[PDB]
Amino acid sequence: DRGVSTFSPEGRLFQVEYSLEAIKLGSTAIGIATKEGVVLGVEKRATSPLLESDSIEKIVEIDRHIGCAMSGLTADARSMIEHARTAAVTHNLYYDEDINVESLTQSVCDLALRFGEGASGEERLMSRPFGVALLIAGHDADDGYQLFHAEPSGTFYRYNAKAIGSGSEGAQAELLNEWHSSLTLKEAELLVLKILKQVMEEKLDENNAQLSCITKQDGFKIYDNEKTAELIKELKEKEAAES
Amino acid sequence: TQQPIVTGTSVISMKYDNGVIIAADNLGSYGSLLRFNGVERLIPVGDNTVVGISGDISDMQHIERLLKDLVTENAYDNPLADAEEALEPSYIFEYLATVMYQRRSKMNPLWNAIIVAGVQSNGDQFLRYVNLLGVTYSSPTLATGFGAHMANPLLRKVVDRESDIPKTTVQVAEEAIVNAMRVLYYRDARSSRNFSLAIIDKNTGLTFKKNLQVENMKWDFAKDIKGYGTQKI
Amino acid sequence: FRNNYDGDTVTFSPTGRLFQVEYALEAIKQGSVTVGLRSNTHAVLVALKRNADELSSYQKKIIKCDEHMGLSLAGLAPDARVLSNYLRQQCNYSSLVFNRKLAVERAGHLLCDKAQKNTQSYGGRPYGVGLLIIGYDKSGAHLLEFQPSGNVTELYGTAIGARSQGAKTYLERTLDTFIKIDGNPDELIKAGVEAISQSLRDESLTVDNLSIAIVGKDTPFTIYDGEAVAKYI
Amino acid sequence: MDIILGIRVQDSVILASSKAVTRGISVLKDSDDKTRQLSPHTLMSFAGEAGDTVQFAEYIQANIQLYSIREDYELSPQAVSSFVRQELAKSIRSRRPYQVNVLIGGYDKKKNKPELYQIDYLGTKVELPYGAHGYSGFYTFSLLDHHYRPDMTTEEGLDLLKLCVQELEKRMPMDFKGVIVKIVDKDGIRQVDDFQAQ
Amino acid sequence: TTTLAFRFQGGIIVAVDSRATAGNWVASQTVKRVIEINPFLLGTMAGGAADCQFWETWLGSQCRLHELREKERISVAAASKILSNLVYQYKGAGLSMGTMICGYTRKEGPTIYYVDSDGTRLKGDIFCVGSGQTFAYGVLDSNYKWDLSVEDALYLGKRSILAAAHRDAYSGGSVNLYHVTEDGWIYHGNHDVGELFWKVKEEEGSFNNVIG
Amino acid sequence: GYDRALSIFSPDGHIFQVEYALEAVKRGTCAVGVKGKNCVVLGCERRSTLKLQDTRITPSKVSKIDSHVVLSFSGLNADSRILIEKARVEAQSHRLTLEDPVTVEYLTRYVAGVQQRYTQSGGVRPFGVSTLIAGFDPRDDEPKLYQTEPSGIYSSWSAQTIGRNSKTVREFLEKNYDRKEPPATVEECVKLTVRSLLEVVQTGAKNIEITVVKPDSDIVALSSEEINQYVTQIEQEKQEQQ
Amino acid sequence: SDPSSINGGIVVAMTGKDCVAIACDLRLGSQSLGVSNKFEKIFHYGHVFLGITGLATDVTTLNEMFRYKTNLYKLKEERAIEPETFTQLVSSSLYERRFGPYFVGPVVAGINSKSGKPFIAGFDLIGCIDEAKDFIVSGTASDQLFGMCESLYEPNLEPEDLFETISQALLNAADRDALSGWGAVVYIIKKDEVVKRYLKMRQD
Amino acid sequence: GSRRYDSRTTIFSPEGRLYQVEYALESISHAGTAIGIMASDGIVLAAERKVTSTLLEQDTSTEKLYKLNDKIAVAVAGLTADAEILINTARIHAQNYLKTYNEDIPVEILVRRLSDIKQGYTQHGGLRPFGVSFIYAGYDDRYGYQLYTSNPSGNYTGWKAISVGANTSAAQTLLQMDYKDDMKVDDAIELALKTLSKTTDSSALTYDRLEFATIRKGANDGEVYQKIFKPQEIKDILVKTGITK
Amino acid sequence: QFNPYGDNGGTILGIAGEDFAVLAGDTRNITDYSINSRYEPKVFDCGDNIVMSANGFAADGDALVKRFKNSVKWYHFDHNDKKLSINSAARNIQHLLYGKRFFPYYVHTIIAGLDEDGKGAVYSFDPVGSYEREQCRAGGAAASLIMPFLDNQVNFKNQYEPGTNGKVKKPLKYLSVEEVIKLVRDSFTSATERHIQVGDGLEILIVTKDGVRKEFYELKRD
């Protein structure tokens, strides 16, 4: 059959690479971090008139200062989140303060390497790495607004803009030019909407797109369908006037 | 929960300006019967530390094996430089005290009181205490048991503070140690005639005098007899 | 054929070594390049950190394991965390139990056993990440190379990561010079920067890329990261 | 304690369960519960520790309602009573026993007969026409044997129960400021709001 | 130590003692005996300082976890009841507490649920817990009424505590007052038993109708 | 003990066992769900290859978690029973601890979670059934219909179908439902469900089963005549001419 | 409270010729206050009768254990258990519950239905096997009961005559007690008809 | 290697079936026939004893007819060996309901515990499933007579007449015609036998290539007497119905 | 029976300024009327502007402080060079005590330092767990003797300027570190007279924003 101890001749395991293929069979997810706030955007998608897209969501709360957008196999991330929240609550008990975005990404990534058929140093409580990648954004009052890309591989990267999902190559290139730390919270959202429409194969409306933000005055707040719509009209009009 | 059925008594020790001295009789009591004499109380560990044990002989044999393990594992994975990274007084102390502290916390106690004495080959003088109660302390003079009561006030007169330390040379310190033991043999019978005396010298390392017996005897008291328990009909 | 001897970790091949060990060995090189050098009083590690993007930023790969102990990795980040956690517990116990700062020799041998053990199962695996483990104890500074095969060698300078050899040949040249620069933090740092540049041939040498770490005669484990390496370029 | 009385009349099971918790001179609360609805046709009274009460109850309720949904028929008063007895019969052998003695009033609606089961914290289950726990029974069995003889209406029972409680508050120095009384019948479970002679 | 909580029109009035003592001379006159579960909820420290401090905070974490998980504000009834179930398992461990878990929810109103180390969870709209409780209940009962305005309700609490401090020497350095409204508690300050005593003696005339 | 793996990650990205699970749903029963403003109806067609059964001592295809929560399935009987057992323990458990019956959303998370978990560990492989979970929250009247699948994914739908010949009836829903008007008439919600199953069952109008859940422990199996009455009405619609 | 004498109870068994008889009270008390005139302390599984006196909680738990053991054994062997086999089954179950804190006095009664012997056998608190066939007594008043049986009983009796013996023997021992009033029953067993005679007796 | 001996045959196929399960359905068709008739007055159970030597005894007719409880009995189509493991666990399942609630187990529950167990082995443990089908005959006063069947996939259904074993289809086709809403036990005895004669894979029919039981209301108790007719008592009954040949 | 628990000497004093804070302790260790040491600290730097002392029985206090020192180590390691404050520690320390009230500890612990606010905080634990906010807290054996003086001269409670001595007071106001050390010295010098659980030497660790400063005064020796 197969095992899970198998390396490639490179020395990088099979399942890990296959996990990166699954992320690309998700949908585009974009996070941009600027001076004020972190914006996270997702495609909710709406494929049928009978589907309730306005009763589901893909942007999930870890804590009262930490959100996440996901792309991949969205079930597999329920286990991951559940574990993160448990960690996040436990830190509020143990020290009475905010949990660093980075300290958490590290904790969560440790249990993404826990796949095996049993070994003599460690517990195995998965057979296979998760099919799912995360963008975790947050705020702490030690290094402010941050963005991290949590791999199922268990590597962890600090970022300022990152896209994941199928269209991440095109979105990330545009992002690199647009990214400035002199952009207001509202601006970041508008630039996020422009790109998110592009990568989309269908019309961009509230009924298939969700904005969400992280402010240090009121934490992670998932933005309303209505507020995000209002800006979609404003995007549409400016854009069709420089043409 | 342990009920002492055997005792060993007395380890007294002090620092001098260039080392430490420690001495102890050799004793295995069964109460008031001096059952065993040839029970060593001073277990030299390397050649710059002496572990002095008073208290229960039954716990003492168990520790005697652990102290020998301590030497062994420190030659494991460290082949050379075994006097710069092995067999240091602070290590010997720390090793022993963790097993002691855990045994008393679970109600199965190591019923000893221990002095670890040395001259560190990385430092200066070492004299550090541990007991069955878990309390630890350092002082220039330390003594356990009956010697904690009786010897130590004599020893404190020699050194009790940093200022008193330059004022004790090799000769004076060794004289104090010999004097103290004799006081112990005289006013407590549990103490054996036979002792061991060890000097751990900052220049000479461990010089260990075996099979000594107390001398310069008191017999003076026999002159002043009037009776004290004698009856007359 | 190939799939026989990759798919099992409780095998061996005709060469005298299993194929999985050859791939794990390859994986260390797939790391970014880092050099280590010592004169045996101080030990320095100079490391080139790459980050994925202009929109990524650097994350730590020099790990304080104690205030006298650390490591650098080259190879697999997931694995490196597992090993670092182990060395950290190991550092802590050494302090609590023995009052020790832990020698590299003792640490290496213990890391070896765990590694061995996970080739003594299906669904355990070699780490496939190498470490240069440094620390300053009482036999001085030390630099070890640990490999996830279990080969532990202490070297006076070395390198792991892609193009190890470039620094290594520079190091075998400058050897005699650096070992007689004893007692200098700043001369050795300067050396490290010079060394890492003989590795390079397809990568840039820039302030933010480079990262320096020290422990030594009069320095407990302190890292220079980011800005703070500019003045040694 | 808490004084818990029961009478099975021909139509019904009437359980009398205290309506006050008295601390010294005054009633700190007089709205306190001493009975828990296990099911639509099962009611259970308790006396013992006040906190042993709730724990036991909520467990027993949860097990019986799992059984009821699963098997598609609410369990009979006889099954439920045996069930409870058994649980008590473990805990008594263990380090912490539950220490609440109960009176279980049920109406078997499938056949249409009233039943009363009196279960001690020991785990002794006995069927009676009337019962009491404690010191209680010494006065009120003498009233009951004499002035009551089976097959009388529900309304005659409320007045009997009142005479019991009146004797108990008088001659026994126990204070608990009477009972709130409940009927388990064919129609299910109703609280009788009146206590003026009932 | 005497702690009380009563339900009235504008919410709950929670009144508590504070006192730390060096001999019988009162060393300091201010401490907490409200444990802040979360902003909407209180659980009071009495009958075991450590047990309350640790586990009400821990209870506070299960609350925060539930409010994240389900997106749902915890009920006062569900929070109390989670604790109570567990507690009876640790009963025999030295574990002792005597507390009111107080909340004011939209679903259930002002609700006070009484909790002791037994698995006890009991409903009632007026509670006193303590050792001076019997006397404190006296003052409360004779002046009780749901239809009392907010200002006089706050004095009622303060005076009932005062009364309980005079006879029993385990309370009285200051009295701290807190009013729980549905958006969370608003402090109504710390009131010195010295100054306050003089006012009450004249003013209330209850146990004092002929000044003693 | 044993803990060798049975889940093995695919170079697809979609695990083998999930993809083979979904096949199990298509072979099985047919289940459809329609929401009202006041109801949620769950329809199932009965297929008995031969019938010597009764309909009262067979286990019925709409199964109670609660007095007011149902779970409906397509797929294998065997698997679905396991999902049911775990949910009846969970029903009671929330009731014990929060003093309130389940929210529907938590239960849905729960049925998903067991499936998701058996994908993730070795030694277990995941279940061959997709479900329709419906019910009502405490103090509520608004219907909830969620759909859970062996991948462990779930999402909400105003109308859905699963099992055999899903395609035809999905389309049938796309042209016979309104999102400015879920019907607030119990009769038209049953009507649509009967039209849907009619087109597939082949024969027989007592091989159609409706289960209606209205608020407050109102779970009701409508009887033979009532069902016949919509079927009469559907042939009047089909043999309409002007 | 008391270990087994909370609710009291006493039990008598006798041997005759193709008959045995086993008799019990119906008391249940709560301390010295008699509560109930009904409580059946003798149970039977087919043609084996088991009376167990003592504390009611303990008689009930045991009764359900032996019912279980016998049912499942009956099911496998396709026939009932025998008096003789059941005495073996009892010894061992009781020796398992000696370490546990039970407070029981079982007595075993039946007639063998294919070996043709009257059979009675006894058990205690310790749970030791007593082979005798004359009378065996157990319960609170076991001391009074042996004195009485040993004088009153005469070997080998017809059912009518066994009835006169057992009834009077119980009734007079019982009259010196308050823990053995609240009514009584007597069962006269042949292996093809059982007669139940209620007695009318004292209470407090 | 441990997983290099594993074959994973316990998993869903590319057709979405379970290899080992499908193979067990096959097993049941190569074992004897078992027929269950439920009437509202009794339940008639037959199971067919194949390979009958004369030095096989005819003093046993309990070796595919097993009482699981004193109101529940089964007829086995399958192996003695598969069945036996489950039979002991069933009997135990009986005693648990009996001890706790002091009343008879429902059939519908008891069946479910067996099916869940069968289901369990093929999901987890790496095990084979049992190759056995049961036809359950039992009585409740909440449902009258109930008759179920469970099979190797962990699926179980209710039937009011059912066949399992060799020639299932053919027996069932005959059953569907001769069935009538009105019932009596003695009428059901005739019905079973008429059918049994026509499903045999050997010419005519004889009493010994049958195992038989009826469930009538009382015969030495108030109601619910399970009577397992022994080979000679079956011989008499083949003449009584008028299948004398 | 057998008690590992005994008695050990010590007295400690924690003082919160509003820009400074000190944690002072004597150095005497006794058991009964014998001297265990005339200089062993009960007062420890756990670092980061956290000073910590577990006064009471020695065996438990040491074990508590070491245990806490490993929590400092773990915090800096797993959370990438992040500072632990006195409160954050206070909560951590609370959890260790309540964790081990199932084999009881017999200490009066006090932690002190300065907040990330910049103003002093002194936290006091009981033997069984629990924590509370304080201004000032004397702990150990002469706690009951020190505290009455201390409330007057530091906290200005029960301390009044002659007049009506109820409306006229010596107010609560900013204090100077030197006059506070003078007060600290006085409290211990009054203590050595009246307690023999105090003696030998005084180590005051004074915590400021310019770091941690140590001061040493000697006391009476028998």
Query: Angle at CA A25, nearest 5°, toward A23 and A26?
Result: 65
Cα–Cα distance for residue pair A147/A33, rounded to 1 Å: 6
What technique solved it?
cryo-EM
Least Cα distance to G47 among G187, G170, G161 occurs for G187
Report CA-CA distances (Å) from A180 to A34, A35, A220, E100.
Answer: 7, 8, 22, 53
Least Cα distance to E56 among I109, I133, I130, A64 occurs for I130
Cα–Cα distance for residue pair H193/H190, rounded to 1 Å: 5
Q: Tell me the longest C-alpha to C-alpha distance in chain I.
A: 59
* Domain extent for C217: 3-233
Cα–Cα distance for residue pair H212/H241, rounded to 1 Å: 14
Cα–Cα distance for residue pair B7/B59, rounded to 1 Å: 10
Q: E strand or H helix at E183, and its extent? A: none
Cα–Cα distance for residue pair F117/F152, rounded to 1 Å: 8
Cα–Cα distance for residue pair A106/A157, rounded to 1 Å: 10
Q: Do E15 and E157 touch, CB atoms closer than 8 A?
A: yes
Residue type, B1: T
Write down the CATH superfamily of domain F1-240: Aminohydrolase, N-terminal nucleophile (Ntn) domain (3.60.20.10)
Least Cα distance to H47 among H62, H59, H57, H67 occurs for H62
Residue F38 Cα to chain centre, angstroms: 18
Query: Angle at CA F94, nearest 5°, toward F88 and F95?
Result: 85
**In the structure encoding, which two tokens stand for residue E96, read together?**
């002792």
Handedness of CA B58, B59, B65, B67 (dihedral sign): negative
Domain count, chain C: 1
Beta bridge partners of E13: E6, E179
Least Cα distance to F143 among F111, F188, F105, F91 occurs for F105
φ and ψ at G141, to 5 degrees?
-90, 35
Report CA-CA distances (Å) from A99 to A141, E150, E175, I197.
Answer: 10, 40, 36, 43
Cα–Cα distance for residue pair B147/G3, rounded to 1 Å: 58
Output DSSP code: residue A24.
Answer: T
Beta strands in F116-227 (DSSP E): 129-135, 144-149, 153-156, 159-163, 208-214, 218-220
| Domain I1-222 -> CATH class | alpha beta
Q: Do I61 and I110 touch, CB atoms closer than 8 A?
A: no
CB neighbour burial string for E173-194, b if at least 16 within 10 angstroms, e if fewer: bbbbbbbbeeeebeebeebebe
The three-state secondary structure class of H238 is helix
Residues 111-140 of chain A whose Cβ lies under 8 A from any Cβ of chain C:
112-113, 116-122, 124
Q: Do B115 and B198 touch, CB atoms closer than 8 A?
A: no
Q: Which are the contacts of B133, defined by CB distance < 8 A and separation ≥ 6?
A: B104, I4, I5, I6, I31, I59
Residue type, H97: Y
Domain count, chain D: 1
Query: Inter-chain contact I80–C96, Cβ cutoff 8 Å?
Result: no
Output DSSP code: residue A58.
Answer: S
Domain definitions of chain A by residue range: 1-242
Cα–Cα distance for residue pair A113/A126, rounded to 1 Å: 9
Output DSSP code: residue I151.
Answer: I
Cα–Cα distance for residue pair A241/B20, rounded to 1 Å: 93
**In the structure encoding, which two tokens stand for residue H159, read together?**
């039937």
Residue type, I176: S
- The full 3-state SS of chain B, as one line of letters, equals CCCCCCCECCEEEEEECCEEEEEEECCEEECCEEEECCCCCEEECCCCEEEEEEECHHHHHHHHHHHHHHHHHHHCCCCCCCCCCCCCHHHHHHHHHHHHHHHHHCCCCCCEEEEEEEECCCCCEEEEEEECCCCCCCCCEEEEHHHHHHCHHHHCCCCCCHHHHHHCCHHHHHHHHHHHHHHHHHHCCCCCCEEEEEEEECCCEEEEEEEEECCCCCCHHHHHCCCCCCCCC
Cα–Cα distance for residue pair E135/E153, rounded to 1 Å: 18
CA atoms within 13 A on the CB side of B75: 6
Handedness of CA I89, I93, I95, I96 (dihedral sign): positive
φ and ψ at I16, to 5 degrees?
-100, 125
Residues of chain E neighbouring A90 (CB-CB closer than 8 A): 61
- The full 3-state SS of I165-189, as one line of letters, equals CCCCCCCCCCCCHHHHHHHHHHHHH
Q: E strand or H helix at G79, and its extent? A: none
Report CA-CA distances (Å) from E127 to D120, E12, E38, E153, E158.
Answer: 31, 11, 21, 15, 15
Beta bridge partners of D183: D14, D190
What single string gives the DSSP state of each residue in chain C?
-GGGSSS-SS---TTSS-HHHHHHHHHHHTSPPEEEEE-SS-EEEEEE---S-SSEE----EEEEETTEEEEEEE-HHHHHHHHHHHHHHHHHHHHHH-----HHHHHHHHHHHHHHTTSSSS-----EEEEEEEEETTEEEEEEE-TT---B--SEEEESSSHHHHHHHHHHHHHHHTT--S-HHHHHHHHHHHHTTT-SSS---TTTEEEEEEETTEEEEEEEGGGGGGG-
Q: Do H156 and H150 touch, CB atoms closer than 8 A?
A: yes
Q: Do F201 and F53 touch, CB atoms closer than 8 A?
A: no
Cα–Cα distance for residue pair I29/I32, rounded to 1 Å: 10
Handedness of CA E32, E37, E42, E44 (dihedral sign): negative
Residues 52-71 of chain H whose Cβ lies under 8 A from any Cβ of chain G:
62, 67-70
Report CA-CA distances (Å) from E35 to A24, F1, H218.
Answer: 49, 47, 70
**In the structure encoding, which two tokens stand for residue D39, read together?**
């099911």
Place of tokens 């006798």: G14
Query: Inter-chain contact D66–F67, Cβ cutoff 8 Å?
Result: no
Query: Inter-chain contact E57–A93, Cβ cutoff 8 Å?
Result: yes
Place of tokens 């409906």: F72
Q: Which of C92, C98, C223 to mutate to test the interface with I (most CBs of I within 10 A)?
A: C92
Cα–Cα distance for residue pair E65/A82, rounded to 1 Å: 10
The three-state secondary structure class of A113 is coil
Query: Inter-chain contact A118–F3, Cβ cutoff 8 Å?
Result: yes
What single string gives the DSSP state of each residue in E84-134?
HHHHTTSTTTT---EEEEEEEETTTEEEEEEEETTT--EE-SEEEESSSHH
Beta bridge partners of E190: E176
Q: Do E8 and E153 touch, CB atoms closer than 8 A?
A: yes
Cα–Cα distance for residue pair I180/I23, rounded to 1 Å: 12
Taking phi over 0 as left and psi of -120 to 50 as alpha, with beta for the rest, D48 belongs to left
Nearest CA in chain B to I37: B139
Handedness of CA A121, A126, A127, A129 (dihedral sign): negative
Cα–Cα distance for residue pair E128/E2, rounded to 1 Å: 8
| Other beta carbons within 10 Å of C4 | 12
Q: Do C21 and A4 touch, CB atoms closer than 8 A?
A: no
Q: E strand or H helix at D99, and its extent? A: none
Cα–Cα distance for residue pair C76/C31, rounded to 1 Å: 7
Cα–Cα distance for residue pair H148/H111, rounded to 1 Å: 8
Cα–Cα distance for residue pair H30/C112, rounded to 1 Å: 59
The three-state secondary structure class of F104 is helix
Q: E strand or H helix at A79, and its extent? A: helix A76-95
Beta bridge partners of A33: A38
**In the structure encoding, which two tokens stand for residue I56, read together?**
């009471």
The three-state secondary structure class of G69 is helix
Residue type, A162: K
Q: Do G139 and G10 touch, CB atoms closer than 8 A?
A: yes
Residue type, B203: N
**Beta-strand relationship, G117-122 and F218-220:** unpaired
Output DSSP code: residue I87.
Answer: H
Query: Inter-chain contact G72–H92, Cβ cutoff 8 Å?
Result: yes
Q: Which of I137, I157, I159 to mutate to test the interface with E (most CBs of E within 10 A)?
A: I157
Domain definitions of chain I by residue range: 1-222
Q: E strand or H helix at I42, and its extent? A: none
Q: Do C46 and C192 touch, CB atoms closer than 8 A?
A: yes
B132 in I contact zone (CB under 8 Å):
yes
**Overall fold of domain A1-242:** Glutamine Phosphoribosylpyrophosphate, subunit 1, domain 1 (3.60.20)
Nearest CA in chain E to A88: E65
Residues of chain H neighbouring G74 (CB-CB closer than 8 A): 70
| Other beta carbons within 10 Å of F5 | 26
- Residues followed by a break in chain H (C to N exceeding 2.5 Å) are none
Cα–Cα distance for residue pair A55/A63, rounded to 1 Å: 21
Q: Do B85 and C137 touch, CB atoms closer than 8 A?
A: yes
Q: Is E44 part of the annotated catalytic residue set?
A: no
CATH of the domain at H114: 3.60.20.10
Residue type, F96: L
Q: Which of E7, E111, E121, E133 to mutate to test the interface with D (most CBs of D within 10 A)?
A: E121
φ and ψ at C228, to 5 degrees?
-80, 15
Cα–Cα distance for residue pair E113/E42, rounded to 1 Å: 11
Residue H169 Cα to chain centre, angstroms: 16
| Other beta carbons within 10 Å of D25 | 9
Residues 9-68 of chain I whose Cβ lies under 8 A from any Cβ of chain B:
29, 31, 34-40, 57-60, 62-63
Report CA-CA distances (Å) from H46 to B119, B181, E200, H63, H228.
Answer: 95, 101, 94, 12, 10
Q: Do H174 and F68 touch, CB atoms closer than 8 A?
A: no
Residue type, C164: S
Least Cα distance to A134 among A31, A212, A220, A15 occurs for A31
Q: Do B37 and B194 touch, CB atoms closer than 8 A?
A: yes
Handedness of CA F77, F82, F86, F89 (dihedral sign): positive
Q: Do I22 and I181 touch, CB atoms closer than 8 A?
A: yes
In angstroms, the separation between the Cα of residue H8 and the nearest Cα of chain C is 16
* Domain extent for B153: 1-233
Cα–Cα distance for residue pair I205/I199, rounded to 1 Å: 17
Cα–Cα distance for residue pair G203/G37, rounded to 1 Å: 9
Report CA-CA distances (Å) from F194 to A50, A209, F36, H131, I194.
Answer: 19, 35, 15, 39, 96
**In the structure encoding, which two tokens stand for residue I211, read together?**
């770091």
Query: Inter-chain contact D73–H100, Cβ cutoff 8 Å?
Result: no
C57 in I contact zone (CB under 8 Å):
no
Q: Which are the contacts of F119, defined by CB distance < 8 A and separation ≥ 6?
A: F7, F15, F17, F18, F125, F126, F150, F151, F152
Nearest CA in chain A to H1: A3
**In the structure encoding, which two tokens stand for residue I27, read together?**
């150095």
Cα–Cα distance for residue pair G143/G128, rounded to 1 Å: 18
Determine if residue E49 is labeled as part of a ligand binding site: yes
The three-state secondary structure class of E179 is strand
Query: Angle at CA B173, nearest 5°, toward I199 and B55?
Result: 70
**Overall fold of domain G1-204:** Glutamine Phosphoribosylpyrophosphate, subunit 1, domain 1 (3.60.20)
Q: Do G39 and G179 touch, CB atoms closer than 8 A?
A: no
CB neighbour burial string for C86-117, b if at least 16 within 10 angstroms, e if fewer: bbbebbbebbeebebbbbbbbbbeebbebbee
Instruction: Report resolution in angstroms.
Output: 7.7
